[PDB]
Amino acid sequence: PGSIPLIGERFPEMEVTTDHGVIKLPDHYVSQGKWFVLFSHPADFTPVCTTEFVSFARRYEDFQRLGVDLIGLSVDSVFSHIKWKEWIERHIGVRIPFPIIADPQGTVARRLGLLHATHTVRGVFIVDARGVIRTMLYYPMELGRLVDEILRIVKALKLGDSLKRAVPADWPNNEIIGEGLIVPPPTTEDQARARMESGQYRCLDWWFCWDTPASRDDVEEARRYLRRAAEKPAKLLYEEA
Amino acid sequence: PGSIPLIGERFPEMEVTTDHGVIKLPDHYVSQGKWFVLFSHPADFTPVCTTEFVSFARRYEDFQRLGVDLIGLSVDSVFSHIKWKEWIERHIGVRIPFPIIADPQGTVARRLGLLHAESATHTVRGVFIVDARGVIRTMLYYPMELGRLVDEILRIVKALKLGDSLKRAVPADWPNNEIIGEGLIVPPPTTEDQARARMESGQYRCLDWWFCWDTPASRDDVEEARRYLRRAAEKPAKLLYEEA
Amino acid sequence: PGSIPLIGERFPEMEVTTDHGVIKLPDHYVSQGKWFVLFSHPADFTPVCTTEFVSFARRYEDFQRLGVDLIGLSVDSVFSHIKWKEWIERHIGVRIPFPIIADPQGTVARRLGLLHAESATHTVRGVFIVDARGVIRTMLYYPMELGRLVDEILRIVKALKLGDSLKRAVPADWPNNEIIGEGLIVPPPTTEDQARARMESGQYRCLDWWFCWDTPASRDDVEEARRYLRRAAEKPAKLLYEEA
Amino acid sequence: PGSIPLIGERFPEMEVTTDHGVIKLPDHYVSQGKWFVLFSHPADFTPVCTTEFVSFARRYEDFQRLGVDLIGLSVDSVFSHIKWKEWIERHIGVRIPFPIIADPQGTVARRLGLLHAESATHTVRGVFIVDARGVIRTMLYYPMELGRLVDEILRIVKALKLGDSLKRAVPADWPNNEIIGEGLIVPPPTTEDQARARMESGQYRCLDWWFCWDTPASRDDVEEARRYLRRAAEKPAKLLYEEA
Amino acid sequence: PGSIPLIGERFPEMEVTTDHGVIKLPDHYVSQGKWFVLFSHPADFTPVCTTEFVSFARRYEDFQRLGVDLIGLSVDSVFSHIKWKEWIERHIGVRIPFPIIADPQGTVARRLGLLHAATHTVRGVFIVDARGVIRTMLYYPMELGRLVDEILRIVKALKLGDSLKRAVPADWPNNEIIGEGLIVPPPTTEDQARARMESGQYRCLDWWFCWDTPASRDDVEEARRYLRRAAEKPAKLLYEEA
Amino acid sequence: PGSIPLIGERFPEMEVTTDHGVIKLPDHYVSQGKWFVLFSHPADFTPVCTTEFVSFARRYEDFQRLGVDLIGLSVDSVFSHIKWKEWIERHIGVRIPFPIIADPQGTVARRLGLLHAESATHTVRGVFIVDARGVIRTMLYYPMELGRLVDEILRIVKALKLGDSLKRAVPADWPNNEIIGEGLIVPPPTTEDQARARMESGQYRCLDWWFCWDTPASRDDVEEARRYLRRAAEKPAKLLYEEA
Amino acid sequence: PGSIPLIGERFPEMEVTTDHGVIKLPDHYVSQGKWFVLFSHPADFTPVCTTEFVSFARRYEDFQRLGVDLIGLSVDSVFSHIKWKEWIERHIGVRIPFPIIADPQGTVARRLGLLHAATHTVRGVFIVDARGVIRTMLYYPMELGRLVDEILRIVKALKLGDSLKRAVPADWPNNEIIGEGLIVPPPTTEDQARARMESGQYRCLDWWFCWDTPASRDDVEEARRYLRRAAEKPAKLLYEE
Amino acid sequence: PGSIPLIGERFPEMEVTTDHGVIKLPDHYVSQGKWFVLFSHPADFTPVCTTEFVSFARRYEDFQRLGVDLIGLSVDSVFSHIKWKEWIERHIGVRIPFPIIADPQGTVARRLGLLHAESATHTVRGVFIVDARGVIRTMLYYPMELGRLVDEILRIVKALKLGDSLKRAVPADWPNNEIIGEGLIVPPPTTEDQARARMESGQYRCLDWWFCWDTPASRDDVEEARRYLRRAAEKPAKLLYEEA
């Protein structure tokens, strides 16, 4: 075993050195009204980590549209960080635009619990505009992340918050209710009766009510992340690198 | 914060009570040569959890064909588990065929770190993917207001199995990586001599001594993986609420 | 062994989640001038617990008429609690009117010591009788395999309330004691000058200076306790099974 | 709080001095293959306790029919125990044939948890029902101001030995239960296959797969249990004080 | 191997329940000007203890004339105390006039160290003065009854010594060397020692051993009466009349 | 705040240096089959202590008759003990024939618990009576300012040795008890069956089952014990001060 | 306030990963009868550190003719070590021939006490003999590069003292009192002090200050050459290419 | 291992007795705006220590010109230090003009961690270079068999002071570095915007964004530091033992 922050707990407070300067977390994003996604990788000048950085950079306009920032994290120094970014721009042709925390010593990696001896695992923390941890994923060294699933998670959490709904499995392609969204269940017997007397919702039981309150633009932006994940590339970047 | 088992550790050994009977973990599944996905949920008779159990049930054959079993977990009692499953089958039309661990008192949940700060009482939705040797390979922690994408779990296990047999690492968004597509990555050299030898030899497609790759996966394996993601992206042509 | 609150102690202060809402104990009831009987059960959808819920429902207006409320407890979720009450009301035809504590981690159970060697997971059949000052007056611990006799719990609250207002102690098997019948016992002198003065005052029926009693109960009080006992001894004219 | 033995626990081993001789517990009764009811009382030469002794003595052959021995306990010496017994035989006419533990130091009182907030000096009115294997089956805690109902202790022992001998659970208020009367309950299925087999056997009366019952008790078993409750409910013919 | 309060210390402060009511030791007596003898016994309705109680009760106007109260102590209940007192009045013909402490659980017994080598106190006697200070302690066993006239001799001889500022020879008022004489506290310096022998104020065997005879003929005869009583065979035994 | 030895405990094993030599306690006496009386005293060449030495010396043959030895204890050195007994012999005309422990540093005094609040420097007047098995039988604690009555110590030893050979307890003021004179007490029954067999036998004189006695002491035993007390009560014929 | 291993102490036993492979210290070198100088540096792709690697490499043949190996240490990864050696070979034209320890996380630096008053080590230098024993320790700050020829003067003099059974004067081989003289260990007893003064076999200033001249003209001019190189400005600067 | 003060730390505050009197460190030098070099030595009347005091004494003017003071240290007494300096002035003809701490006890040696595993009794040859603010700048630890090169300690204080005023870092072997000669290094950019601003500005000679340099030091400072290395390499013209 080994200790982690938890969902519903605020992001632990800390000042960090990134290749764009020194920032304090979570406060730096909170003050702008932004959510952030923090991801980590074991080592600069490593192949799977480089495939992930490029995937995030291609989907960067997509996170911005939602009001989310990206920040990465490795145990390497700021100097290795910048030497790495320049090698990606010159060899693959893609500029990486977001910061990376430099953590030699592994201080931040231990606080977040990312040590599963010397290099961190591929941990993901999704953190909201009040700085609360909303999801976490832990992939290992030998498997790249699917970045469109991270876009799906973040879009569906902000839509649940704004419409006061829960989000079913595989949304918006759920086999029971497709693009429907779930009313949070009643917690007292009186509340449970009141709900059924209203026939205000579609209803499988007092505890499984649902409606269709999301705009068509919300549902089709979500499905488009999954459509992209499923499509064969038209042109591999290796071909003209 | 909270103490969790870690990637590369053996799944903690424990006797558990399920609605199919008493079992020993990880040994029950190690004994059969199988991998297992253990997923947990806050409470019985709650709507997102129902949608998830129905989603795993629809994909149960695909898990079976890889060699993977499924076991659930929540804080309710086996008698609630059994009553909840009659409900799903009577109203939704779908049979839940896999076991659920009854954890009243929350002993297994504490043992695994499934108790977070969004509730003193009910587990988050954690997932542990465990290999045929008993070893933890991946853990996801989705919150209670958001259901999982179950097709990503199939893509994880299929990619881990290909990686182990072929001795390769797996790129971002495989088998649709934007840089190398369905290609797989050769584990990088860790010495100066080794990195010179890779280059002399000229046997792999190559961007630098640390970024070499090939295409050793079969067309059946690649196609099976594209299938899971096409299905996640497709709208179902008949919805199950339509007939309850 | 295991820790338990004690007769004479105030009920441990605590906030609890019920199927009627969140409340604070013992304050929710102290604030209304009410006694309360808290009783506990090992799990929802189990047969003996169902029989006891139906028997407490039947007597519920007898409790109210005494100024006493009822609250249950078990280790399941408020979602199971509300499912199991709709079942009782559908199939047996009895609506259950009082709240049940949802204690999915066994926190409330560990605070009260309802966790006994029978089961790691689900609580015994415990009963706390609590008065209008929040003070524990009586505790009973029946096992999982044996239901309570509910008319004996009404006899206990009736007798306690009589003893408290009449300043008396209550004989075995009241109001049918084989020595003094429906008599009530004056608390014993604790000094030689008190003992001398009570047998010279000549004011009570008397077996020795330490055993005096009189009969200050109403005909109505007496008849009302004899009623509970007669209902316990009588076979019901109709069983609820017959029309389910 | 304070600590106690628990249901399902072996009665703590201990040597004790009584007014009949020194014994080891629970071995002295286990070794004869006998159940016993150990009961406790704050002090010799007090009124409520005297009413209880007389009531247990009168029902003494009723316990002997069921194979149950009776043992009392208080903080006074063997000397007071024997002077107290003589005063009851001489003034009430009832002689007491069971022993009483002398515990002048509260050694055994503390071991069993019998020292509540009502007093650092004298035990509460505890009852432990212990089977022929030395296991605690049931516990009752009544306070100083209220005498026990002794006929309810006889119903408890009776129904527990019936349970054991038929593999059955015993509903609320048995043998007068409002749902099923004198019927006894089958232990519920704990797996999904056991549950379906029970619904398809048609072997029992059935309200659901988790609530089945039958009427396997003899008429003697049933009518013995109801006779205890009858006696408890009946107004006494002649009171004992009248010729005292 | 066991933990008692000590001669020269204040009797421990405690409140206690007796068959006369609740009282505070040693305050209840301190605030009346009274010494007290607290004696303990293992169990009520036992024979050597009943002998001892009837013996204190017969000498009770003797303690009272001296300004001494009596208080018993045992592990039994107050209900047991009164029933035991009643039997002794009804059978032996003697009323027990003084209070007895109820101590089930033995809390007071332990605070005082009255558990020797499980369950019932031994035969302990504490003699306590009107300042509340422990002056003398006696520990007789279960199988041996006390001599009550010797406890009267101790109380009489301590108050005499407190009053006259003297110490008391062995076997007083019949000491083999100086009779009913009382001893002058010894010199503690070489100059005190020389001046004491220069005054020739006292009968004197060395500068460390001087004495005088300052006790009243009434004091000495009262002390002698207690001892003559302990040596005299009663003419009529109380059993003869039961 | 003082820890001591206890009645019924073995006298604590120790080597001590006396003015007659080094001895081992309680073994020196045990191996001779002898009882011993250990008394202590504040200081050599103090007056009350000198009075006591003289009285113990005068009664020395009395202790020899009973098979009892005497041993003294103070905090001074062996050199003063000897100087001190030379002074007594030349100014009183009486020889002290028994040993005195030299205890500078109060090692033996602390181990005996003889250092009391009256003094930080000098021992109290402690007396241990020790039987032929090495066990503590009685203890008396007189102050600095009040000498012992040596005749009562004689009475205690005669009476204890008599109780032991006859199997009898000894009444207050023996052999002049005001209830039974020179009668000796049968240890009381401890069980009800025992209590009534004593009462059915006419073997003893009885005032109740718990109070039986008889007169098994010899005339010689009885007159010896009364003579110690006859002596304590006689005014001296001649004072040792006069021709000294 | 920091916990370093000490002169005369055995070098701490440990298994380290270097960009030549995993090795064990000091066993790896003791096996060969080699001495070793281990030196540390804050960070790859920083400028003072690079000037120092180039300086040891140019003197690599001198350390080898003495039977001394070289091994570096910094908190970055093996990957960024290999990429840093490629950059220096390509741009400066000098090949780094010795291994560097990768110490992500800080584990080896802490054991050796190399973090003084956050994230990267200071420039410590340990000199370790063929028995595995620490002989000399030097600690220069991050802002100031080492003088490499002084480290050869130390290694050379210590080996001469060991084989000759002699102590070495300040400034050797140009000591102002005895020049290239070497010092006889002093007597430690009154009778050894009288004898030495009687023998008359050595030049002597007092019984505690004796010396002679047992080093060969070759040993002596080798030590001087290290100092003449230090004092001489190079005739062509490498940045000139 | 052992425990040291560290580069970047303020020098440990302490009162010390030297052969010039009592002083406080680091304040005595901080008050005057001076750097100091503290250097330590195993024992007085030893040969390699002596050679080293002589080399420091020759360079006394070179330190004072830089505004740096010298202070020695060993575990001997002031009396020993004084007699040793009189020996050197008379038998070598060189007066030692700086103070030496007398540290008999190794109190100061322990605090600085100068007690190594070479010796239980005498200090190692340690040097602390300390700046005008009190802060430790560089530390060196030569063993008792090897004497220091004093011209390198002069190059280090000189290079460090030029670093501070010019805000530059100093390359290997300065002023004779083989890549940039007497050039000085600009501290590298720490952010990407900053790397790029620097490359496009033409302000510096440049090898890469992280490796920029210039020649801001004057010919007086360059030539002064090359001169200390020149003298170190010079064969002496006269040996001092020659005229001694």
UniProtKB/Swiss-Prot annotation, chain G:
Residues forming the Thioredoxin domain are: 5-160
Q: Which GO terms describe its cellular component?
A: cytosol
Cystine bridges: which residues?
Answer: C204-C210
Which GO biological process entries does UniProt record here? cell redox homeostasis; cellular response to hydrogen peroxide; hydrogen peroxide catabolic process
- Please state the Enzyme Commission number of this protein: 1.11.1.24
Q: Where in the cell is it found?
A: Cytoplasm
| Subunit comment | Homodecamer. Pentamer of dimers that assemble into a ring structure.
- What family is reported? Belongs to the peroxiredoxin family. Prx6 subfamily.
Q: What else does UniProt say about it?
A: The active site is a conserved redox-active cysteine residue, the peroxidatic cysteine (C(P)), which makes the nucleophilic attack on the peroxide substrate. The peroxide oxidizes the C(P)-SH to cysteine sulfenic acid (C(P)-SOH), which then reacts with another cysteine residue, the resolving cysteine (C(R)), to form a disulfide bridge. The disulfide is subsequently reduced by an appropriate electron donor to complete the catalytic cycle.
What is the name listed in the Swiss-Prot or TrEMBL entry for this protein?
Answer: Peroxiredoxin
